[PDB]
Amino acid sequence: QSKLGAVYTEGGFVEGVNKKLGLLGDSVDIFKGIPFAAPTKALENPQPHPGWQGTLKAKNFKKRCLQATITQDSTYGDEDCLYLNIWVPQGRKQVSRDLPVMIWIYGGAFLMGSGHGANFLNNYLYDGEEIATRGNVIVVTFNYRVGPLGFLSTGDANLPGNYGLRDQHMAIAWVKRNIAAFGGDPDNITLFGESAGGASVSLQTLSPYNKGLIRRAISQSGVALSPWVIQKNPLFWAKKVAEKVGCPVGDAARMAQCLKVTDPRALTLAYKVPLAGLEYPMLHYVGFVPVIDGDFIPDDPINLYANAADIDYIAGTNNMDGHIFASIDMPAINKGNKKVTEEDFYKLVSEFTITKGLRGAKTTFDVYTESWAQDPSQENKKKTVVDFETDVLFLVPTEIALAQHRANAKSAKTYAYLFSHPADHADDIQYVFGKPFATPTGYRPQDRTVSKAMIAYWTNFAKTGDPNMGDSAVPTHWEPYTTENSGYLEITKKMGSSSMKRSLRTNFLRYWTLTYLALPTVT
Ligand SMILES: [Zn+2]
Ligand SMILES: [Zn+2]
Ligand SMILES: [Zn+2]
Ligand SMILES: [Zn+2]
Ligand SMILES: [Zn+2]
Ligand SMILES: [Zn+2]
Ligand SMILES: [Zn+2]
Ligand SMILES: [Zn+2]
Ligand SMILES: [Zn+2]
Ligand SMILES: [Zn+2]
Ligand SMILES: [Zn+2]
């Protein structure tokens, strides 16, 4: 009477595990490996999963979708991968009902990842237990297809792409139809995700496929407007794969059907992004990502924000999000005894501004190195390289998305954040998921303070659309974003009234959205 037991879903009964928590009667019901769609076919849209007889034992994580290992030498996962996982918190007197529902979408550059995440200190990163029990919400995680098997496309109807986005949508629709049986409120679904997952969250809110399914959304370090998200030239990348696996490249239809019957492991390993050295910035080699298909993504995402008019929305970034691509594009920023020079940075800037030619390279170099005259230290120069990559890859897209969502808002609220700290220790995911509480030996008291506050804001928002209002106290009043106030919450170790800030790097946002765009395109 205080836990779920066998749950009747549309496919049949499902049995999970009840984990007792604390000493006074709380617990958590955990379901792992519930199928939400059929075994996948290579480069075909997902399909309903047939029902089952008896009681499905949802006791273990299932296989991730077929993908390259990080050494890009081999593969793991399986074509039968579309499974989801659920954490339902339980109090000590009665079974939970009408709980808010948060669906996590993992990142991994659309190339790798799974619903459980990396394992460290005997804990999966996306283990939803700490969010669910501390915020009194239901947490869902799930697998979607990645890499060529998730995103290969010819840019036309022969191979329209976006298979992995359709997988995500199928998981969302399943939760909407079924989660009330677990104690969830299906009218109150919040998506959240990071990096490619944050851009996926954003894409899901913009797609007409999700009309009436999504109540709220959180984009962490990634939005549909980031430059690494939409592949403008998919036929080029599909031809690359066709040549390495021996398919003809003359006719799009013939090539498409050849790829569909190619060993999916050969498809997955067809292309390896070089590690070093590269002729172009890292951004150039993001290949198999979403496309504008005129269907799931009917138009350029910038034109789609009417679809999110009643979806409350949080979006934010990490202060040094770009350090990942910056280290690859300029390895000197990590080597303490190697210099970054004006010539190195010009070269990097010029590669990002090719469409505006020499003038575009100069105006950008000039604005980012303005501070170098008074502070020529390597510390200031290397920080500048990171800030540049953060701005173009994360911050500027995110600010444009916030502005677009606010301008199209009807009932929707809009919120902005900057996460500042001090895998790497600076990253948001581990604090959002409560890792400092689940594996506390690896973390210090200040880490639990930050994670406690992030889970409070996130789960208050899931409950009410107001990060300040819900089951948890918060340290700083988080003011909704408007064009006039342009406010963001700076999330740090010690928060108070001055944590609510405004006008994040506005001179740089204005440069990219006004000055740079006013330059003539060269050819
Ligand atoms: Zn199955
Ligand atoms: Zn696994
Ligand atoms: Zn198999
Ligand atoms: Zn009810
Ligand atoms: Zn649908
Ligand atoms: Zn390029
Ligand atoms: Zn170039
Ligand atoms: Zn992150
Ligand atoms: Zn990071
Ligand atoms: Zn820390
Ligand atoms: Zn207020």
What is the number of strand segments? 16
CATH superfamily: Alpha/Beta hydrolase fold, catalytic domain
How far is it from the N-terminal to the C-terminal residue, by CA?
A: 70 Å
SS-derived structural category = alpha/beta
Briefly, what CATH class?
Answer: Alpha Beta
The largest pleated sheet is described as: 11 strands, mixed
CATH architecture: 3-Layer(aba) Sandwich
Question: Percent range for helical residues?
Answer: 25-40%
Shape: globular
Specify Rg, calculated over alpha carbons. 23 Å
Separate helix tally: 15
How many domains is the backbone divided into?
A: 1
Q: In order across it, which strands form the biggest sheet?
A: 3-4-8-10-9-11-12-13-14-15-16
Our estimate of the beta-strand percent is 15-25%
Bound compounds, each kind once, are: zinc ion
CATH names the topology as: Rossmann fold
Layout of strands and helices, then pairs:
Elements: E1 7-9, E2 12-15, E3 17-21, E4 26-35, E5 55-57, E6 67-68, E7 75-76, E8 83-90, E9 99-105, H1 129-135, E10 138-142, H2 147-151, H3 163-178, E11 184-194, H4 196-206, E12 216-220, H5 234-244, H6 252-260, H7 264-268, E13 312-318, H8 323-329, H9 342-352, H10 357-368, H11 378-407, E14 414-419, H12 429-432, H13 435-438, H14 445-464, E15 487-491, E16 500-502, H15 506-515
Parallel strand pairs: 2-5, 9-10, 9-11, 11-12, 12-13, 13-14, 14-15
Antiparallel strand pairs: 1-2, 3-4, 4-8, 6-7, 8-10, 15-16
The structure holds zinc ion (11 copies).
One zinc ion binds at residues 61, 64, 114, 116.
Glycosylation sites: 188
Disulfide bonds: 65-81, 247-258
Subcellular location: Secreted
